[PDB]
Design a protein around this ligand. Structure first.
Ligand code: SF4
Length: 192
């Protein structure tokens, strides 16, 4: 039967799409297998590629800070991953065939963890999860900051889209919006 360990093993030696040729390390994701909160980003950047870990760059450090200061959590209490797990060449967006190739890893991760809340960071991860939900996706600007109920298997999963933290690095107002979004996420997390 499946496990997060198996997914990690498959991912780190995975050659199922053309992104494999460009990487130093695949990025399978990390954190608590019974996390109530699961963060899903787009694809790895250059620091993530170098470390084999998600959200470790400047954007990741901001994420970490918000998780600590606003949610009140350490990273090892949540689960963090990406819809695509290898860094696209020249940091382009992933292509449909790449999202198609890689996303079953994410489906499998969701299947195992069954989080209370999935926080989708940015337009790509949000659009992917919306497609699995069967929810119409317009733009990240239009859907961010709202909770969506995803009936999945026996559970309701709350999906909460927001901006990617990299977008908040040099934009004070957008960072204030992300912070407010994380406040709503904490409220969702602590409410029965
Ligand atoms: S991006 Fe995903 S499917 Fe493509 S090689 Fe990396 S782990 Fe495999």
């Amino acid at each position: 039967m499946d496990s997060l360990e198996k997914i990690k093993e498959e991912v780190i030696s995975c050659k199922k799409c053309k992104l494999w040729q460009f990487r130093t390390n695949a990025v399978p994701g990390e954190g608590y297998p019974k996390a109530e909160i699961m963060f899903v980003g787009e694809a790895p950047g250059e620091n993530e590629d170098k470390e084999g870990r998600p959200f470790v760059g400047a954007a990741g450090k901001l994420l970490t800070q918000m998780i600590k200061e606003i949610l009140g959590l350490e990273r090892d209490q949540v689960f963090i991953t990406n819809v695509v797990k290898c860094r696209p060449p020249n940091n382009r967006d992933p292509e449909e065939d790449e999202i198609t190739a890689c996303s079953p890893y994410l489906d499998r991760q969701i299947d195992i963890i069954m989080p209370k809340i999935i926080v989708t960071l940015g337009r790509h991860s949000t659009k992917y999860i919306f497609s699995k939900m069967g929810e119409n996706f317009s733009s990240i600007t239009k859907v961010r900051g709202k909770s969506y109920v995803w009936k999945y298997k026996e559970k309701e999963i709350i999906v909460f889209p927001t901006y990617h933290p990299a977008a908040a690095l040099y934009n004070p107002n957008l960072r204030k919006i992300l912070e407010e979004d994380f406040k709503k996420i904490r409220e969702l997390a602590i409410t029965p």
